[PDB]
Ligand binder design. Structure first.
Ligand SMILES: NC(=O)c1ccc[n+]([C@@H]2O[C@H](COP(=O)([O-])OP(=O)(O)OC[C@H]3O[C@@H](n4cnc5c(N)ncnc54)[C@H](O)[C@@H]3O)[C@@H](O)[C@H]2O)c1
Ligand SMILES: NC(=O)c1ccc[n+]([C@@H]2O[C@H](COP(=O)([O-])OP(=O)(O)OC[C@H]3O[C@@H](n4cnc5c(N)ncnc54)[C@H](O)[C@@H]3O)[C@@H](O)[C@H]2O)c1
Ligand SMILES: NC(=O)c1ccc[n+]([C@@H]2O[C@H](COP(=O)([O-])OP(=O)(O)OC[C@H]3O[C@@H](n4cnc5c(N)ncnc54)[C@H](O)[C@@H]3O)[C@@H](O)[C@H]2O)c1
Ligand SMILES: NC(=O)c1ccc[n+]([C@@H]2O[C@H](COP(=O)([O-])OP(=O)(O)OC[C@H]3O[C@@H](n4cnc5c(N)ncnc54)[C@H](O)[C@@H]3O)[C@@H](O)[C@H]2O)c1
Lengths: 338, 337, 337, 338
């Protein structure tokens, strides 16, 4: 029967994950039964229903009272405690925690859910220290059922890794540089304010803001042959969702743009179906809102020089497309549960 | 003889105040000697110098070490403690604390700076409970030197009150409604997230966000005859700075637009000089960045119906113009200490 | 028996109207058979389908060739001529032209479609000179079948008029002031550039831009008792769609907020059903995208002072909601042809 | 004595060029004596003074009447005719026309100023057909005084070329890929509307909008050895000014990031002084508003992989920094006038 899931942190990814699940609920081995977050159920039900990015939730009615959120008559219990050791995970029979607060990404932090009584934790971010990292359609079939804490990597990693995997197998990637032009996120400031990163301190909707990203090194964890071969940066720009990666590879087998495109297109129809989408259309970021693929290759931006320098460009919905992946990873753990 | 000032909360208002003071430093009875804020001096020196709104600070070099910010060789001591009772105000000889955190606006909260040793507190926001409230050019000459905690009201109140005072004296305001179309502030969320106010919870740069404001009631505290006669709302919109108030008054003496304009123009040249500016130009918000006035009356938007229903519209730089007024209030307290 | 419609100007309103019609196509007495626009059918089919505001059109497939757009197998003929006298309206048997270019709003301009052979014109904007003006749910039942050129007013007028009509009938409006805080439109510039209006010349997504509006005077054309009693302004702000009107009325019968709210709620359930929606929710602009009502009253912002000064605030999707009303006006003309 | 200049097209670049000149007026061999534009002098004086990006012009008073704009008592004559053959260039003794309309970039278009009586034209954009192209600090000393029509290339080309020139000379560029994350410009639409380019048709302040750029191929015109070796794209994003280029080169001489940085820094102090600025600061786009350099290298984003794959990142103020270059090219033509 059902794997009982709790969401810790009812943020952009927490609530996108909940909306993904509510739309895939008839096929699922998961049942979302609890939420912990720093605010109350009435606030959270309001935000779950009224989303500036996704619009008004249509499929089912959403209400709340002092201790539950109700979404189509399914009652989701709510609690509010910043310290996960205190959570009622044993009492609610929680099997799997979706860890989406952004502050419990190390094994020591995420373990406190295990102390509270949960059996497994899926971190919706890169892990700190050695937490196994999975990207669906790249390495998720290597999942080991005895693992109690996993990571679903970052949005950028989920866009980049499948593309790198297709190219590496067809051409042999020797080295690779990435830049993601990425929507701002809640980690940045609305107006100039203190932050650990002096660039992220700056008014996010007024600026182009460079920042580091672990996505390119993290690709080497999910494609171990490429460990150390990729590097990259991010530019945060004044859009609220939808991001784009630009990837430039030095490859071994000499090629041209038409063949790079053909190889990706062929993978998008077969081995990476549902993960990579191949687009020949002349679209912009708003058109990819709500797209279910991890990466949408923009085929007419592909270019190659001298045989060996290859550039591809791919879109991703960093909230929604990532949340669909978290749900897929979760369903996969549910189907291989021990 | 210099009044020693500490800034508590080195945010948009705290740092705007500091820049205002650094530019008026030769005339001043204040000396900023300390800052308390939740982050460190290097971060704060970087933010003081590199401002998305004001630009790069030009006049003087700004550096920092582990415990000071240096702004043109003037050393400003820094500490970092969330609880103001712990602050070293007696040890630094602090006379006046500029309370700019947004979280110590009641008397009980602001009094903790007095417990820590400061002699007076100027809150950069409306006071909760009865804290005397001053708007420079409206009632600051009623300031009483024995008051230990005061409020400089909100940016919106500083824009609205002087205009109300001029109109009330010329025409007799019986009732009035305000809407401010206001730049977003740090109090709102960048992307939809939890907040006390369900509207402020929503992505600030993507939405028009209505929200309540006490600015219209607060005008009744600084013009006591109008207590209970005014009300209003705010609309937060996707600009980072510069705001506009739209005020509709029911007045006693019948009038027309040209006369309403003339009365405010006259006050802008005499009693409200430096507080109200009168503009006949067709300008937009970005042209008011850095403006020193509390209100800039946009004269061609003035309209009157039926003699008695009067609408005026006025701009304000909610960060800079307000901070100039905090500095003026502070210099006034300094002069009457 | 179908009324054959051509769209002149396939802009934001033209394409919103087309999408509105494609979704209400089974109930309709209209058939859209032609489009004239300054660009070509492939470009226009791409823009019809891929909309930054409405999203990707889902219901039906949309394709194009050199001379038609196809939307669910329905073929819409396309031509491209700036001068409406040259248009092939007799050759296409056009009954009704939806005039959405923004440049043929006088009778002389709109009459050129009649010269070209159309039998009637519905202008998607206020008329210049005396063109009969209709607001659905306020005066559309006064439409006279012999009129050959009509106006559906502006988005702001469609939001304001129904609320004014309800309030006037319950309390007696003596005078009223409006400000609309309005999304930018294609009429403004992306970056500072030449324009007839020096304010609209300025970068629209960086500024609050005041501008005049005839919406408040135009309410007097559709509620003739209020002619000359209303005035207002607009503030354009950096959102791409969804607008809000703030209306302050001086009324004859003394009242309070709860009663003003109740009267509008009651009208929203009966006489203004589908035209005014009454909302008690704490929502922001992006939540009103796609709303079908002409006005959405935001009930908790309602305030009253002194019995007689009443403020209400109402939302409108200026592209979609307005286009639903153009379609309703058109269906009404169709039913009375 | 003075070269008499007219500005055709009083747009973002036309008015930025005018403000650059008003601030460098005491040193100059140019005198701006006329403007042609599609609107009137009162509108244009208003826009010259009140700028959403540059702020209120401070140095001098600016007024207008029916036929002049006055800027500090200097009277600039104004006319308004879309067709440059009709312009009064002989009657005003115009030597040099700054062609900033964006619509007269071919030799046939720009020549009509010569028919009207001007002696030379400087196009503030890439030329169409063979118009000599100059980038100050890369090839402007090759200027030939007998040329009657020239191009000052694009903003992106002025940022990229000097950097490519420094790298090519130190490491030998074999191939190179560029992406510019670029502020929107007046060429894009405010809300979705018809455009020759289906991506630029889309609401510029709401979208990330890919688009082609000739900047990378144009580098091969100013550095002829690299002709055919560079390619690239642009992403337009919702900021109104300030842009960033990300350049990834395959080089011949193996290197590391510290040495790439050192070479650029050394050029910024010597041969490219005033053209390339080397920044070690953690800044964002708004901080580079008004910067006079063509390219500001963001040194801590530099990275190298495998010796031969080099990535650098540089900022530019696409309006102001480009306009300073146009003024420099003009002053250079003035000092070598025939
Ligand atoms: N584009 C994206 O937004 C994106 C994509 C992929 C991964 N991620 C990652 O997902 C995680 C969450 O990101 P987000 O964008 O939802 O941020 P967010 O700030 O919207 O969500 C964080 C939520 O957790 C709550 N929270 C914080 N501390 C808590 C605690 N101690 N206990 C309970 N709740 C707490 C916050 O109030 C908020 O509701 C981060 O790790 C982020 O790196 C984000
Ligand atoms: N337009 C405006 O921004 C504006 C105008 C007028 C008045 N105000 C008022 O000024 C005050 C601050 O506004 P802001 O816009 O500067 O906010 P902000 O968040 O930018 O500034 C608050 C600063 O204080 C710090 N802080 C928070 N808690 C603290 C504590 N316990 N101890 C020390 N520092 C702490 C924050 O880290 C930040 O540096 C508020 O009362 C606000 O309502 C703001
Ligand atoms: N919020 C709104 O957008 C809104 C709301 C209500 C009413 N309106 C009114 O609707 C009308 C159009 O507004 P819009 O926002 O759709 O503008 P828009 O610029 O998007 O649309 C105008 C369309 O007509 C085309 N056009 C221009 N001249 C033409 C000609 N001579 N012949 C054929 N086509 C021509 C343009 O190329 C464009 O496709 C205006 O009268 C406007 O005031 C707009
Ligand atoms: N970032 C930038 O803005 C940038 C940087 C480098 C180069 N450029 C290039 O500079 C040129 C102008 O760009 P811009 O951003 O100033 O655009 P813009 O639209 O602001 O300026 C064009 C000006 O010329 C006017 N105009 C158009 N046709 C005309 C005609 N036939 N006669 C007279 N005036 C006419 C327009 O009204 C406008 O004032 C373009 O060629 C552009 O590619 C732009």
């Amino acid at each position: 029967s059902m794997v009982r899931v709790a969401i810790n942190g009812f943020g952009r990814i927490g609530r996108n994950f909940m909306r993904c699940w509510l739309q895939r609920k008839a096929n699922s081995k998961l049942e979302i039964v609890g939420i912990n977050d720093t605010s109350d159920p009435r606030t959270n039900a309001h935000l779950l229903k009224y989303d500036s990015m996704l619009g008004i939730f249509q499929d089912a009615e959403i209400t709340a009272d002092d201790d539950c959120i109700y979404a189509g008559g399914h009652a989701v219990k709510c609690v509010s405690d910043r310290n996960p050791e205190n959570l009622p995970w044993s009492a609610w029979g929680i099997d799997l925690v979706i860890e989406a607060t952004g502050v419990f990404t190390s094994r020591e932090g995420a373990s406190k859910h295990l102390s509270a009584g949960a059996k497994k934790v899926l971190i919706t971010a890169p892990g700190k220290g050695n937490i196994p990292t999975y990207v669906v359609g790249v390495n998720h079939h290597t999942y080991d059922p005895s693992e109690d804490i996993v990571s679903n990597a970052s949005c950028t990693t989920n866009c980049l890794a499948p593309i790198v995997k297709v190219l590496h197998e067809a051409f042999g990637i020797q080295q690779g540089m990435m830049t993601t032009t990425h929507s701002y996120t809640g980690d940045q400031r609305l107006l100039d304010a203190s932050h650990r990163d002096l660039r992220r301190a700056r008014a996010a909707a007024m600026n182009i803001v460079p920042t580091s990203t672990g996505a390119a090194k993290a690709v080497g964890l999910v494609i171990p042959e490429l460990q150390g071969k990729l590097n990259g940066i991010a530019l945060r720009v004044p859009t609220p969702n939808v991001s784009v990666v630009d990837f430039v590879a030095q490859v071994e087998k000499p090629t041209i743009a038409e063949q790079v495109n053909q190889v990706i297109k062929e993978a998008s129809e077969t081995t990476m179906k549902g993960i990579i989408h191949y687009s020949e259309l002349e679209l912009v970021s708003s058109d990819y809102r709500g797209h279910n693929a991890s990466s949408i290759l923009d085929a007419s931006l592909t270019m190659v020089l001298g045989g060996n320098l290859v550039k591809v460009v791919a879109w991703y919905d960093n909230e929604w497309g990532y949340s669909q992946r978290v749900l897929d990873l979760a369903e996969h753990m549910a189907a291989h549960w021990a």
